[PDB]
Each structure stands twice: as C-alpha cells, then as structure tokens.
Amino acid sequence: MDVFLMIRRHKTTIFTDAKESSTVFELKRIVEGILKRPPDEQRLYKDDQLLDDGKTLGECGFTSQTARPQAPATVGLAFRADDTFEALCIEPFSSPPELPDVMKPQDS
Amino acid sequence: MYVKLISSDGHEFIVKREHALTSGTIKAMLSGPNEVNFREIPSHVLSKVCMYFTYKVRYTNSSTEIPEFPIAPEIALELLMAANFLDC
Amino acid sequence: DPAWWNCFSAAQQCDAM
Amino acid sequence: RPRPVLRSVNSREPSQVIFCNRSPRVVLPVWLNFDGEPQPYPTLPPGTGRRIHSYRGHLWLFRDAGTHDGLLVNQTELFVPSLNVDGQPIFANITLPVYTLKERCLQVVRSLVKPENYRRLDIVRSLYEDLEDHPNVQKDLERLTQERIAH
Ligand SMILES: *CC(=O)Nc1ccc(NC(=O)C*)cc1
C-alpha cells in the first residue's frame, strides 16, 4: 500500500513515500515542493524507462514489496536544460573498502 | 519539512525533519543558532543511515510484522561507527 | 497497560507485604 | 530485595497459549519460574507456530536463540497467559523490536567476528566494550525491574 522511494539525480538523493494509488504527476508535485521545479520540467524513470504522468506508482512497477522502507526503490530523475531534457544521470555511491581479514567466512 | 544531509564524497540527501530528528546528534546540529555536512561519513553509509530514519519512523509503534533491517558486512563496520557517533 | 505491568505490580505488593 | 518479582504464580489454572514467530530469528521461549529464574524451552523456527500448555498468570520472554537478542511479544516485553474465554487460545505473536541502529550494527558484527577478534578491529575505544557487552536476559530483567520501580 505504502511505497518508499529514492528520487535520485546526479548526487542528489531524495527520500519520500507515497501510496500505490498515486500518479507519477502527483510525485512530480512532491519534487516541485522540494527542488522548486514544475512537473513539465521533470522526467521520472524506473531504471531507464520513462514513466508518464498518467500512471500510478503501483502500475509503473513500484509495489509495496519492492518499494519497502529498509530497501526503497530508486526513481530516476532528469530536468530540462533550456528546452531539451538532460541525459538521465545518477552518480553512483562511494565504494566500501576491502572486508577485513577477520570478517570473512572461512570454514572448510 | 525537509532537511539536507551531505556526505563527505559529496552526495546530497534530503529527508523529512521528523526523520532527521531520529538521530539525537542531528537534533542539536540544527536546533537553531536547514543543511548539515558530514565530512567523515561517505555516501554509501549516509544513504543506509537515511534508510534507518524511514525504517524507524515507519515501524515504531506499528503493530504490523516488523521485518529485519539488513546490513551488508562490508558496510557493517562503517555503519556501526556512524550509528555510535550519530546516536540512533 | 501491558498485561505484565499488572503482573509486576501485583507481585511487589504481595511479595513485600 | 528479598525475592525477585518478575515471576509466575502457581495458579494451577491451565491456559492454552500459541507462540507465533513473526521474526526471521530462531526464537527461544523463556518461562520465569515461581522464583524469578528463567526456564528456557525448545526453540521456534522463523514463521512457525506452536500451541503451548502453560498456566494462567505465568511470565514468558522471548529472545534470539543464538545471539540472545531481545524480542518483543504482542508489542511488549513479557507475556502473561490468562483465561481462554470460549475456546479461544491466546496468541503470543513474537516480533522484532525496532532496534537502535547502533545495537543493530553490533548484532551483525558479533555474528561475523567472534569474541577474541573484537579487539582486533580498528574502531573507536568505547566500542570493543559494546561489542563484548552481549544481550543478557538476567541483566535485562534487572533493568526491566529497576525501570518500573520509579513508577
Ligand atoms: C502474571 C502475574 O499475575 N504474576 C504475579 C501475580 C501476583 C504475584 N503475587 C504473589 O505471588 C504473592 C506474583 C506474580
């Protein structure tokens, strides 16, 4: 019922939640209240498929079993540069270092 | 109301205020003389920390079946030090 | 109140008359 | 000061009880005898149930069978059987608590490194002590008793 999201663009990561019976345009309103940009200047993406304004989050593929709290689903975002939208980019996170010599399984 | 939490490597995490006020340490950094920098917390840790905020706000008091909060071993050592420092 | 809050308090009063 | 008070009465009145394990851990049901001492009982696999013949007015606490991590039952610490009104067995839905992220991270690390390597980790000083301070039932009963005394 409740879906939890990570709206991401480049280095920006937004954490919010909506309901399955809420549309993508309604989610673009949520970003408008945050990043101060209108929906027609936003393009939301599941991975790399462009989600149109008319469909609900559950219909786009954000079911409650995938858009959970402890593991929220990434929602791609791209803004309009001048008159043409940017290329959908989400800068990856930092990588963790090598697992120490002790924390390894080791059992023969 | 939304606040912004920055990682050392330069990621910008925007979460609700009641979510950020889960950490007692963060309550004080923005109590008043918002935006916060964490110069020893990378992005892969601060992101998981932000997930715990949503995890606690959601499942505290809730009579539902509470699921495990997952932590990968490679980030377990770093997430612990941040959890100690961030107090949450 | 939880069911064991009464379980505690009833013991304290009974045990320590 | 004399007798510990987290204890069960010998009410001799039977009571149907069902433990449900709505947690991914292997739950260890624990009954406090009439003297406050905890009696362990056979473990519960995750997602499983079990009817249990306990008695009206007993006390039950549940922990992780391997790590002794604390668990909630019916959203609270301890469980008290009672009358079975019209057939009705009493449900003891064992659940996880919303752990503090610190205690949760210790839970993971304690399951990867094993005692003698707790001090082989390059972490801050007051964390080896937290790692070595494992979840204890006997001490959490002292805490649970001391908490409500002020109320
Ligand atoms: C669950 C419960 O009822 N515990 C309980 C109640 C009363 C007493 N008092 C005496 O035994 C004298 C102990 C435990």
Domains of chain D: 5-95 (2.60.40.780), 96-147 (1.10.750.10)
Q: Tell me the domains of chain A and their CATH numbers.
A: 1-102 (3.10.20.90)
What's D82's DSSP letter? -
User: Which technique?
Assistant: X-ray
Nearest to D17 by CA among D97, D72, D79, D95: D79
Evaluate whether chains B and C are touching (3 or more beta carbon pairs less than 8 Å apart). Answer: no
Q: CA of D57: how far to CAs of C13, D32, D97, D143, in Å?
A: 16, 11, 24, 22
Q: Which residue of D has its CA nearest to B83?
A: D102
> Fold for domain B17-85?
Potassium Channel Kv1.1; Chain A (3.30.710)
Enclosing H/E stretch for D145: helix D137-149
Q: Identify any residues that bridge with D151 across adjacent strands, giving them in sequence order.
A: none
Centre of ligand 1 from the C-alpha of residue C6, in Å: 9
> For residue A8, what are its two tokens?
């991401």
Evaluate whether chains B and D are touching (3 or more beta carbon pairs less than 8 Å apart). Answer: yes
Determine what percent of chain C falls in helix, strand and coil, rounding each to the nearest 5.
75, 0, 25
- Taken in order C6, C9, C12, C17, the sign of the CA dihedral is negative
Q: Identify any residues that bridge with A81 across adjacent strands, giving them in sequence order.
A: A84
- The Cα–Cα gap between C1 and C6 comes to 8
Q: Which residue of C has its CA nearest to D150?
A: C9
DSSP string, chain B: -EEEEE-TT--EEEEEHHHHTTSHHHHHHTS---EEE-SS--HHHHHHHHHHHHHHHHHSS--SPPPP----HHHHHHHHHHHHHHT-
* Ramachandran class of D47: left when φ > 0, alpha when ψ lies in -120 to 50, beta otherwise: left
Nearest to D65 by CA among D43, D50, D37, D46: D43
Q: How far is CA D66 from the centre of its chain?
A: 12
Resolution in A: 3.5
Domain boundaries, chain B: 17-85
Contacts of residue D7 in chain C, CB cutoff 8 Å?
11
